[PDB]
Amino acid sequence: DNPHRFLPANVSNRWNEYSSAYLPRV
Amino acid sequence: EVPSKESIQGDATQQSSKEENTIITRDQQQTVSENIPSTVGDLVIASSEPTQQFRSLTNRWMPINSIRVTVNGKRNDLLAQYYIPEDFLSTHAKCAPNTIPFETYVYGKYELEMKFVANGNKFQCGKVIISVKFDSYQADNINTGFQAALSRPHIMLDLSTNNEGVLKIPFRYHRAFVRNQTHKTATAGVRPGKFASIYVQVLSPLQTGEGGANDMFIRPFYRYTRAEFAGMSYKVPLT
Amino acid sequence: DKPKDVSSITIIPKPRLGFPHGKGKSDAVAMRVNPVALTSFQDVSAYPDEPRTTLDIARIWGLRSTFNWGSGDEHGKELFNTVLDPGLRFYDQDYEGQITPMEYVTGLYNFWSGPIELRFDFVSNAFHTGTVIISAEYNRSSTNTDECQSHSTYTKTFHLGEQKSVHFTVPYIYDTVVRRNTASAYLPVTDYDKVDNVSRAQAMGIRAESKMRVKVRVVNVLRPVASTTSTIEVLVYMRGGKNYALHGLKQSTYWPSNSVVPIDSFPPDGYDP
Amino acid sequence: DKPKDVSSITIIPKPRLGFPHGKGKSDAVAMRVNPVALTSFQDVSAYPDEPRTTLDIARIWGLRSTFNWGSGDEHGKELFNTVLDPGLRFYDQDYEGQITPMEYVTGLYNFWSGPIELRFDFVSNAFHTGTVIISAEYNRSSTNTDECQSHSTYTKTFHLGEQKSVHFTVPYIYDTVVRRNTASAYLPVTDYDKVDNVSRAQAMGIRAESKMRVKVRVVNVLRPVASTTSTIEVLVYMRGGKNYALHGLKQSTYWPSNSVVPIDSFPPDGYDP
Amino acid sequence: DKPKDVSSITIIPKPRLGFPHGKGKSDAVAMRVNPVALTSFQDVSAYPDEPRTTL
Amino acid sequence: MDTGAKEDEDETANFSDGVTAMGFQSLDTQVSIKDILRRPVLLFNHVELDPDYTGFFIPIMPPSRMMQYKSGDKETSFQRLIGRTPQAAIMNLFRFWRGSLRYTIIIHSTDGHPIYVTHVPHTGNRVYGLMKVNNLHEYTKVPIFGCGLTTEMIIPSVNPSICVEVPFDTENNWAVTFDEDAQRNYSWRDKGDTVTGHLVVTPVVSVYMSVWVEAGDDFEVSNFYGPPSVKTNDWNYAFSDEH
């Protein structure tokens, strides 16, 4: 399916955006 | 502003900020970001009932979690980040008296201040940038470099001198108020408790001498300079 | 003499003059003997008490709902409990009945704001006596059984007895200056077409359902005398406040159900028996 | 009476009123009830500290480059050496990264002029000590090894020690009042097409590459104490001067690289899982 | 109110405004940000000794 | 109208009324009744004309529950969405109107053939669509426009739309808006009192047409009736803000 729809669980919070705890995103 | 000769207690020319029942001193000078305005006038329309302030509770300095800068961190690396007010409620300083009004009220407008205190030795050197991004929800992974950090309202911390910074954050949101608390019976259509983001980034990597320390620490403090609350409700636990 | 006319100007040709507006200028050609004559309102004119705006219609008291209150209703019980949204009455079922004048006029607009007023008329007498608490609850709602949660909001305890009517202004407290209407801006379905998820996916707008409720709970259980009725009915009226406001004209939410017949040619279409 | 209208004028019919302009007059038809109403900025308005022009954006300090300065760097060595053109960063390679706000805004325009400002922040302490010379060189450039040639231009020797920051205005000295931008005015290639000389031959414009350089050389070799680091990093910031000026809007030089996704219909396009 | 506009005039449609003339009026649309801006001759201007006419 | 403030005998303390949000987004205020009814409403969407008939009749009455589509009844040339317009919902509350209306005609052509428009004054009948007046098989000799009633003309090539303003030609103080039944055979002089006349539209050849309508500048409604008994099913054809 379209991969952009949902963010993978390990990097994201419940609200389906990047978690504040996950610093490596940059 | 001007240092004096050495007495029993060193160079005793320290200033201090006294806010409610918490004092924070500073050794060297202070960097301050420009005092800029917030959205006003919509307040009286969007809230039919009168809005309340709890200065004694919310205007006191609250220390949050410590940040660990190492010699391995490259340029553009996030040292920390904070979705506010969400993270000050339920993530950092969970039992702070600053959070008491957020239990009962459902809406509010928040102008913040954030003081940062660094303590690296005189044989270290490095630059850290702290910057605010107003209304960052689903916009965290773009315009999030050191370059954009220098453009937005920001402070700059040299890790050798141990200067202090104070970042003033106006309320600049697309809606009139921001929702404080999520709940089982509340709507899932809106993202609550996040009107801004605070990034702390390595502008230049930390460096040390031969047989020197491989890290040093920074401590953020926050305080609401204008916390107005509207829509009283039954008290709930925070997240 | 026949001197040449050297004056000129660049024009942008448009078909209609002020087509989409409800005011300003117009290029209309009067079908009269006199091109600048108008209908005289010297004798026959609009009466002063008729509503001049839709905000005047939204200040007419309409009967929203009713409910019962017996002696058997233990304290804390929800007598009445609705989502107070002027946009829609229900989110989960077809509505049919007589909508209130403020709801009817609201359905014409995409956005609303300002306070809403209620009025609870207890169909009782001198010998009925109880106490109810009317609470307005925003964002987060209480549980049916936990009366304490309802008490910790904006409340007005009404002591029923000699007085049989209580007015209640619901204060407008939301994150946005105006709420948008939950009813759709445009709905072409007219023949009660059986709906699917593909139909829903291609809607005009996304229904932002209101979580703001108004509950009525028992404080003091209704203790009537033996000689009168044990259960009374309560009438709940509703109008827009004095600072009620509407914006963004759309396709109407509600439409006439009862006694709708399409016009025909009179008397060509077999009127002569 | 019905008298004949003898007045007339010659008109030149145009489709649009002031299509290409960013000011003046317009023939726009408002999609409102009132034809002459506007958006109120009584409460919600632009904040005073926001940039009103692009020249305000071009006065924001952005971090251009960085370089190192060790104890092993013998005197006269080029620490830093770039072509200071706000048009393009490189002439001979693909650039990727975070462009400075004055470079970003410049890329929108075909011509620029006026002085450029630099600011060198040495990431050091009290115990570091050296001396660098910052030279601006026009038309003719020096050899890497001949430091004397660099000294005979417009220079500012900075004595590093207690102060860790030096500001440097680069004076605008060229044969023309405005330089033209080295980046192309229009580039239709979007799919990284493999380039040939026939492609180059049919370009929009001819890239007039700037020979104006800014070099930083060692005057006094960096002599730090044993207990501190032997090599420091220098941060080179850059903004437009107080008399910086831009003209001739073109297709932008730079475009967003990171996290670009094209929009789709929500919620028709399979948003419902 | 939405009153009807009763004012009118008879126009003679021409394509160009003052096509054959070397002076007078023109219907030209400036290709600028500002519709009424012009080239400045503050510094750079015609030198006084240059011929202004063919005579 | 009656506010019902008559019955508000409560004199106890209440919450604040706040400040009005009118003119906050934009000054364009859309709340006025005489501004909504002055907005144009569409009636006939690409209906066909014929030279064989007398012309196409458009009964001069404001758009309301009279011009509403109900499900599973006889098909008409009127568009279905007249029922559910904001301009119709207003006319469902007022049973009297007076003053001029404003019809806008748009011919789907660019030919030299002229189309005509003819305000016939209130003559008692309430016909619409194409009609053969007096069942004759030839109207080119004696046209409806040529009889000598007030008449404008569209010339599609010059401009393929006109906006006429038809006068309030009637013996009544007020024109009635609606009835409980449109198709009911009751006393004939009263059925006529819901129109103030007709527009007719004759072409030279066959052609399609669109008709809009609104209230003129001089226009007043009165005799307020309150809101009717209604039905809705908007909830059903949209996703919640929670999937």
Next chain:
Amino acid sequence: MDTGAKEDEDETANFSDGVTAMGFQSLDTQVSIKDILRRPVLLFNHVELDPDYTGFFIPIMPPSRMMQYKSGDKETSFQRLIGRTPQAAIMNLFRFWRGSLRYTIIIHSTDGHPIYVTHVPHTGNRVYGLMKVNNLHEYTKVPIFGCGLTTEMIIPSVNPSICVEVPFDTENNWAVTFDEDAQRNYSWRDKGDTVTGHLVVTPVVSVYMSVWVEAGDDFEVSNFYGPPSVKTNDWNYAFSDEH
């Protein structure tokens, strides 16, 4: 915004700033942000309309990184060069805007058939292109323009282009410009807050169309974000001034 003059603690002598070269070539000054955004940008270049659908939807949002083409992804009706306009690059720095926009439609026709334009107010969805609203197979009876929303009309023969000015109809103080991801399925009431409504464009028959856009007179941007991370390769597709 923050100048960064805060950190400029240097108080040593410097070279002259000279004199500004503004107004030297011409008085027409193009530096203003509210003048660049007021220039028209092209969106849809000769896209097709159909009478079979409800109409063609144009979401009312300013042109930015949202409307950008990336290489080797799904094809859209949006033109590719929206990404690289000067008017887009400005909107990439500001995340909030407010006030009216100005859409310009140009129908490729000279027929008597009328085309309509309909400002639908902010209703939460963000659809574009052709859509069958509620999956019906017939919209000629009940058109989107006929429902009774604000509506203008183009008559191609008279003048085959209009310039509308769509109002800021929303409950928000500000309309959001962009997101980190357009195609991400997050909370539904927030995805809606990047548009202030839609334009719809219904024709009688099939026809092609072009759409431009700009900021209105009443238009303010705010919430400055600084410049993004960018890429370029202009150097590659041009000869040096030295062969």
